[PDB]
Design a protein around this motif. Structure first.
Motif, PDB file in Angstrom:
ATOM      1  N   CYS A  97       7.892 -15.624  -5.734  1.00 50.37           N
ATOM      2  CA  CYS A  97       8.732 -14.464  -5.500  1.00 50.37           C
ATOM      3  C   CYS A  97      10.038 -14.686  -6.260  1.00 50.37           C
ATOM      4  O   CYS A  97      10.744 -15.671  -6.029  1.00 50.37           O
ATOM      5  CB  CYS A  97       9.028 -14.281  -4.007  1.00 50.37           C
ATOM      6  SG  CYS A  97       9.773 -12.664  -3.659  1.00 50.37           S
ATOM      7  N   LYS A 139       4.764  -9.699   0.139  1.00 52.26           N
ATOM      8  CA  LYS A 139       3.914  -9.173  -0.914  1.00 52.26           C
ATOM      9  C   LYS A 139       3.677 -10.238  -1.981  1.00 52.26           C
ATOM     10  O   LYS A 139       2.586 -10.335  -2.541  1.00 52.26           O
ATOM     11  CB  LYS A 139       4.552  -7.923  -1.516  1.00 52.26           C
ATOM     12  CG  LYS A 139       4.595  -6.759  -0.532  1.00 52.26           C
ATOM     13  CD  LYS A 139       5.235  -5.513  -1.128  1.00 52.26           C
ATOM     14  CE  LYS A 139       5.346  -4.423  -0.070  1.00 52.26           C
ATOM     15  NZ  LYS A 139       6.028  -3.201  -0.580  1.00 52.26           N
ATOM     16  N   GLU A 166       1.162 -12.529  -0.529  1.00 50.74           N
ATOM     17  CA  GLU A 166      -0.124 -11.851  -0.540  1.00 50.74           C
ATOM     18  C   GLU A 166      -0.816 -12.026  -1.898  1.00 50.74           C
ATOM     19  O   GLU A 166      -2.021 -12.258  -1.958  1.00 50.74           O
ATOM     20  CB  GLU A 166       0.082 -10.358  -0.246  1.00 50.74           C
ATOM     21  CG  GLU A 166      -1.202  -9.546  -0.149  1.00 50.74           C
ATOM     22  CD  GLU A 166      -0.955  -8.053   0.039  1.00 50.74           C
ATOM     23  OE1 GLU A 166      -1.909  -7.345   0.427  1.00 50.74           O
ATOM     24  OE2 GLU A 166       0.180  -7.579  -0.209  1.00 50.74           O
ATOM     25  N   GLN A 167      -0.050 -11.917  -2.980  1.00 52.16           N
ATOM     26  CA  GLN A 167      -0.598 -12.055  -4.334  1.00 52.16           C
ATOM     27  C   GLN A 167      -0.589 -13.495  -4.826  1.00 52.16           C
ATOM     28  O   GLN A 167      -0.986 -13.783  -5.956  1.00 52.16           O
ATOM     29  CB  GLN A 167       0.196 -11.183  -5.316  1.00 52.16           C
ATOM     30  CG  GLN A 167      -0.014  -9.685  -5.136  1.00 52.16           C
ATOM     31  CD  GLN A 167       0.794  -8.861  -6.120  1.00 52.16           C
ATOM     32  OE1 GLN A 167       0.853  -9.178  -7.305  1.00 52.16           O
ATOM     33  NE2 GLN A 167       1.407  -7.789  -5.634  1.00 52.16           N
ATOM     34  N   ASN A 168      -0.135 -14.401  -3.971  1.00 52.34           N
ATOM     35  CA  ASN A 168      -0.056 -15.811  -4.315  1.00 52.34           C
ATOM     36  C   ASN A 168       0.727 -16.047  -5.610  1.00 52.34           C
ATOM     37  O   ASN A 168       0.207 -16.603  -6.581  1.00 52.34           O
ATOM     38  CB  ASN A 168      -1.458 -16.401  -4.439  1.00 52.34           C
ATOM     39  CG  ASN A 168      -1.585 -17.728  -3.727  1.00 52.34           C
ATOM     40  OD1 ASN A 168      -1.006 -18.733  -4.149  1.00 52.34           O
ATOM     41  ND2 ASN A 168      -2.334 -17.737  -2.625  1.00 52.34           N
ATOM     42  N   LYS A 169       1.982 -15.612  -5.620  1.00 54.52           N
ATOM     43  CA  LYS A 169       2.830 -15.801  -6.785  1.00 54.52           C
ATOM     44  C   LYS A 169       4.251 -16.126  -6.383  1.00 54.52           C
ATOM     45  O   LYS A 169       4.634 -15.939  -5.233  1.00 54.52           O
ATOM     46  CB  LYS A 169       2.776 -14.564  -7.682  1.00 54.52           C
ATOM     47  CG  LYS A 169       1.555 -14.614  -8.593  1.00 54.52           C
ATOM     48  CD  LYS A 169       1.162 -13.286  -9.141  1.00 54.52           C
ATOM     49  CE  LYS A 169      -0.172 -13.415  -9.860  1.00 54.52           C
ATOM     50  NZ  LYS A 169      -0.730 -12.079 -10.146  1.00 54.52           N
ATOM     51  N   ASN A 176       1.758 -13.756 -15.244  1.00 52.90           N
ATOM     52  CA  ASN A 176       0.818 -14.017 -14.162  1.00 52.90           C
ATOM     53  C   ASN A 176       1.355 -14.967 -13.089  1.00 52.90           C
ATOM     54  O   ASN A 176       0.666 -15.257 -12.116  1.00 52.90           O
ATOM     55  CB  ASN A 176      -0.499 -14.556 -14.735  1.00 52.90           C
ATOM     56  CG  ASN A 176      -1.690 -14.261 -13.833  1.00 52.90           C
ATOM     57  OD1 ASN A 176      -1.861 -13.135 -13.359  1.00 52.90           O
ATOM     58  ND2 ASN A 176      -2.522 -15.269 -13.599  1.00 52.90           N
ATOM     59  N   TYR A 222       6.195 -12.491  -9.012  1.00 46.29           N
ATOM     60  CA  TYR A 222       6.189 -11.220  -8.310  1.00 46.29           C
ATOM     61  C   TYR A 222       7.680 -10.888  -8.274  1.00 46.29           C
ATOM     62  O   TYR A 222       8.446 -11.565  -7.590  1.00 46.29           O
ATOM     63  CB  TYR A 222       5.683 -11.320  -6.870  1.00 46.29           C
ATOM     64  CG  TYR A 222       5.904 -10.008  -6.148  1.00 46.29           C
ATOM     65  CD1 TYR A 222       5.045  -8.927  -6.348  1.00 46.29           C
ATOM     66  CD2 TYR A 222       7.046  -9.804  -5.370  1.00 46.29           C
ATOM     67  CE1 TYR A 222       5.319  -7.668  -5.803  1.00 46.29           C
ATOM     68  CE2 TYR A 222       7.333  -8.552  -4.820  1.00 46.29           C
ATOM     69  CZ  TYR A 222       6.468  -7.487  -5.039  1.00 46.29           C
ATOM     70  OH  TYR A 222       6.757  -6.244  -4.503  1.00 46.29           O
TER      71      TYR A 222
END
Length: 191
Positions: free
Chosen positions: A96, A88, A91-94, A28, A31
């Motif tokens: 990279c 991206k 965007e998903q707040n993770k 979780n 990304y």
């Protein structure tokens, strides 16, 4: 802004194994960046997962727009990571996570799109071992295999001219992952 994580080193040092354990353990939080390639998609390969399979015309259009964080050429095909992969992740707040070879890292270190990334250099136990693993997973002829050997020698030479936040000689997977994990827990996870 979550600082991107770059696990780098020449092919054959165990980057893939280390990254899989990491993603499996902290699914979780990351990304995983997916690259583009002009190489034809193999049977077991999945679009958008293994790579974004495109053709030379599209790849050239992307370079024209300077849409890449880094691009490379291997075995007569083009590869490259788009700046959009980073978007991206945002965007998903993770975090990279970029898997790169040394040729890629030097392009990232100059990239204006990304900044403050954490670079982790995964080194081979030795040059002999690195070159040996090359021959093992390859069935090429003299001239061609020599070219890949020289490419790996260049990777290591180029790596010597760059600075990394952490460098680990991957002799033992378990110990390497442990050092890696602790470093990342302190950099991203804890608190």
């Amino acid at each position: 802004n979550i600082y991107p994580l770059v696990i780098c080193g020449p092919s054959g040092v165990g980057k893939g194994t280390l990254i899989k354990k990491l993603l499996n353990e902290f699914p979780n939080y990351f990304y995983f960046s997916v690259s583009c390639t002009t190489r034809k998609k193999r049977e077991k390969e999945k679009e958008g997962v293994d790579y974004y399979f495109i053709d030379k015309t599209i790849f050239e259009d992307k370079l024209k727009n300077e849409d890449f964080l880094e691009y490379d050429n291997y075995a007569n095909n083009f590869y490259g990571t788009l700046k959009s992969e980073y978007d991206k992740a945002k965007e998903q707040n993770k975090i990279c996570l970029f898997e790169m070879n040394i040729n890629g890292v030097k392009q990232l270190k100059k990239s204006t799109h990304i900044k403050n990334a954490l670079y982790i250099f995964i080194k081979p136990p030795s040059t002999d071992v690195l070159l040996s693993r090359l021959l093992t997973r390859n069935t090429e002829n003299q001239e061609q295999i020599q070219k890949r050997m020289e490419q790996l020698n260049i990777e290591l030479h180029e790596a010597n001219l760059l600075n990394f936040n952490l460098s680990i000689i991957n002799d033992d997977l378990t110990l390497t992952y442990q050092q890696l994990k602790n470093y990342l827990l302190n950099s991203y996870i804890h608190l």
